Design a protein around this ligand. Structure first.
Ligand SMILES: *[C@@H]1O[C@H](CO)[C@@H](O[C@@H]2O[C@H](CO)[C@@H](O)[C@H](O)[C@H]2NC(C)=O)[C@H](O)[C@H]1NC(C)=O
Ligand SMILES: *[C@@H]1O[C@H](CO)[C@@H](O[C@@H]2O[C@H](CO)[C@@H](O)[C@H](O)[C@H]2NC(C)=O)[C@H](O)[C@H]1NC(C)=O
Ligand SMILES: *[C@@H]1O[C@H](CO)[C@@H](O[C@@H]2O[C@H](CO)[C@@H](O)[C@H](O)[C@H]2NC(C)=O)[C@H](O)[C@H]1NC(C)=O
Ligand SMILES: *[C@@H]1O[C@H](CO)[C@@H](O[C@@H]2O[C@H](CO)[C@@H](O)[C@H](O)[C@H]2NC(C)=O)[C@H](O)[C@H]1NC(C)=O
Ligand SMILES: *[C@@H]1O[C@H](CO)[C@@H](O[C@@H]2O[C@H](CO)[C@@H](O)[C@H](O)[C@H]2NC(C)=O)[C@H](O)[C@H]1NC(C)=O
Ligand SMILES: *[C@@H]1O[C@H](CO)[C@@H](O)[C@H](O)[C@H]1NC(C)=O
Lengths: 98, 50, 170, 50
C-alpha cells in the first residue's frame, strides 16, 4: 500500500528473476487513463436532511446526479442504500437540491 | 639531504590527504542514508496519505 | 603537495598512482550528491501552476505559495529559512541544480497536491475541490466525512492559526 | 555541439475550480523492471605472499 515503493501506480503483484549478482523485479501496476469533466457537490439536501455517500462521490453530466466509485467511472442512481444521513442542510457549504 | 626532507614533507601531507578523503567517504555514506530516507518520506507522505 | 616545484614532483613520481586513486573517489562523491538531489526532488513529470483566483474553502496558503515580488520567487517561509542559516589547490564545484530550479520543483509539487490530491503521483493530475479532498483524508483515518463538512470553518481557522504560529516560531 | 539550459519538464495549469472533478474511464496495466545488486565476488588476499 505504501506509495511508489514498488511500481509507479497502484501495485498488483511482482515477479522475481535472478541475475549474476543481484535480483530483478517485474512490478505489475494499474494506471488509469481517459479522464473526463464533471460537476460535483459534497452533499445532497432532501426533505431538509443532508445525505452523504457511503463509498463514492456525487457527479453530474449536466442534468442528472449520480454516485460513482472514485477510481473508475460507473454511474449509479442515488438510492437510500448507498447514502447516509447526518443533520439538516443548513450548515454545509455546497449542498445542492435533488 | 634535501630529498630526505622533501620525503618527510611528502609522506606527512600524503597521510593528511588520505585521512581527509576517508572522512569524506564516511560522511558521504551518512548523507546518502539521510537522502534515501528523505526521498521515501517525500514519496509516501507528500504524494499520499500514510 | 609540491606547491609548483619540479624536484618535489620527481620525488613524488616514484610513489605510483596514488593521486589517480584519490581523485577517483571525490568524483564518485560529487556524482552521488547530484543524484541525491535529483532523486529527492524530481518526483514529478510536469510542472504545475496554481490558478490566479484562490478560494480553497477558507484555507489560506499565502505564506506557502511563492511570491512573485521577490526575484527568486521563493515563498515567505523559504525566505526566512534562507535568511536564518549562515585557495590552495582545492576547488568547490557548483551544484547542477540552481536554487531557483529547486524552488520551481517545490512549487510544482505543492500546487499539484493542492489541486489534484494524490492522483497526480500515480497517473495524470485530476482536479478535485479542496474541501472534498480533506473529506477523503478524514475518511482515511477512520473519522467519517460528515465531521469535516459540519466543522469546516473551525477547521480552517485552526489550520490558519497553526500556520501563523509556525511562522512566528521560525 | 550545443550548450543550453536544462528544461525541468512540461508546463500545464490544471483547471482548478470549486465544483469540478475528473474521473478516469479506462485503465492500462504496466510491467516495469527494477534491478538491485545483492552480492559481490568473495576475494581472499594473503599477507605474506603479497
Ligand atoms: C446524462 O445522463 C442521463 C442518464 O443516461 C441521460 O438521460 C438519458 O438520456 C438518454 C439519451 O437518449 C435517454 O434515452 C434517457 O431516457 C435519459 N434518461 C431518462 C431517465 O430520461 C442524459 O441525457 C445525460 N445528459 C447529458 C447532457 O449528458
Ligand atoms: C464556488 O465558487 C463560486 C465563485 O463565484 C461561488 O459563487 C459565489 O457564491 C456566492 C454565494 O453562493 C455568491 O454570493 C457569489 O456571487 C458567487 N460568485 C459569483 C461570481 O456570482 C460558489 O458559491 C462556490 N461554491 C462552493 C460550493 O464553494
Ligand atoms: C432547495 O429547496 C428548498 C425548499 O424547497 C429551498 O428553500 C427555500 O428557498 C427559497 C428561495 O431561496 C426561500 O424563499 C425559502 O424560504 C426556502 N425555504 C423554504 C422552506 O421554502 C432552497 O432554496 C432550495 N435550494 C436551492 C439551492 O435553491
Ligand atoms: C491569508 O493570510 C494573510 C496573512 O499573512 C493575509 O494577508 C493580510 O491581508 C490583510 C488584508 O487582506 C492585510 O491587512 C495584511 O497586511 C496581510 N498580511 C500580510 C502579511 O501581507 C491574507 O489576506 C489572507 N488571505 C485571505 C484570502 O484573506
Ligand atoms: C480501453 O482501452 C483499451 C486499450 O486501448 C481499448 O481497447 C482497444 O480498442 C480498440 C478499438 O476497438 C482496438 O483497436 C484495440 O485493439 C483495443 N486494445 C486492446 C489492447 O485490445 C478499449 O476499447 C478502451 N475502453 C473503452 C471503454 O474505450
Ligand atoms: C475540463 O474543462 C476545462 C475547461 O473547459 C479544460 O481545460 C479541461 O481540459 C477539461 N478536462 C479534461 C480532462 O479535458
Amino acid at each position: 500500500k505504501r506509495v511508489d515503493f514498488c511500481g509507479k501506480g497502484y501495485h498488483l503483484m511482482s515477479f522475481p528473476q535472478s541475475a549474476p549478482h543481484g535480483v530483478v523485479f517485474l512490478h505489475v501496476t494499474y494506471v488509469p487513463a481517459q479522464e473526463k469533466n464533471f460537476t460535483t457537490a459534497p452533499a445532497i439536501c432532501h426533505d431538509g436532511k443532508a445525505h452523504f455517500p457511503r463509498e463514492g462521490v456525487f457527479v453530474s453530466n449536466g442534468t442528472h446526479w449520480f454516485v460513482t466509485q472514485r477510481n473508475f467511472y460507473e454511474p449509479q442512481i442515488i438510492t437510500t442504500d448507498n447514502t447516509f444521513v447526518s443533520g439538516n442542510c443548513d450548515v454545509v457549504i455546497g449542498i445542492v437540491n435533488n | 639531504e634535501a630529498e630526505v626532507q622533501i620525503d618527510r614533507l611528502i609522506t606527512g601531507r600524503l597521510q593528511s590527504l588520505q585521512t581527509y578523503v576517508t572522512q569524506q567517504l564516511i560522511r558521504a555514506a551518512e548523507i546518502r542514508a539521510s537522502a534515501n530516507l528523505a526521498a521515501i518520506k517525500m514519496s509516501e507522505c507528500v504524494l499520499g496519505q500514510s | 603537495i609540491c606547491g609548483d616545484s619540479t624536484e618535489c614532483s620527481n620525488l613524488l613520481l616514484q610513489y605510483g598512482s596514488f593521486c589517480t586513486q584519490l581523485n577517483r573517489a571525490l568524483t564518485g562523491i560529487a556524482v552521488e550528491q547530484d543524484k541525491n538531489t535529483q532523486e529527492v526532488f524530481a518526483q514529478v513529470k510536469q510542472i504545475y501552476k496554481t490558478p490566479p483566483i484562490k478560494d480553497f474553502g477558507g484555507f489560506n496558503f499565502s505564506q506557502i505559495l511563492p511570491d512573485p515580488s521577490k526575484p527568486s520567487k521563493r515563498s515567505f517561509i523559504e525566505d526566512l529559512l534562507f535568511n536564518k542559516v549562515t585557495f590552495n589547490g582545492l576547488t568547490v564545484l557548483p551544484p547542477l541544480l540552481t536554487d531557483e530550479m529547486i524552488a520551481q520543483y517545490t512549487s510544482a509539487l505543492l500546487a499539484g497536491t493542492i489541486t489534484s490530491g494524490w492522483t497526480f503521483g500515480a497517473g495524470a493530475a485530476l482536479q478535485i475541490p479542496f474541501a472534498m479532498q480533506m473529506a477523503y483524508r478524514f475518511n482515511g483515518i477512520g473519522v467519517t466525512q460528515n465531521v469535516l463538512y459540519e466543522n469546516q470553518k473551525l477547521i480552517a481557522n485552526q489550520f490558519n492559526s497553526a500556520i501563523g504560529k509556525i511562522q512566528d516560531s521560525l | 555541439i550545443i550548450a543550453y539550459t536544462m528544461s525541468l519538464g512540461a508546463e500545464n495549469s490544471v483547471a482548478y475550480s470549486n465544483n469540478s472533478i475528473a474521473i478516469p474511464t479506462n485503465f492500462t496495466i504496466s510491467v516495469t523492471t527494477e534491478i538491485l545488486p545483492v552480492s559481490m565476488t568473495k576475494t581472499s588476499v594473503d599477507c605474506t605472499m603479497y
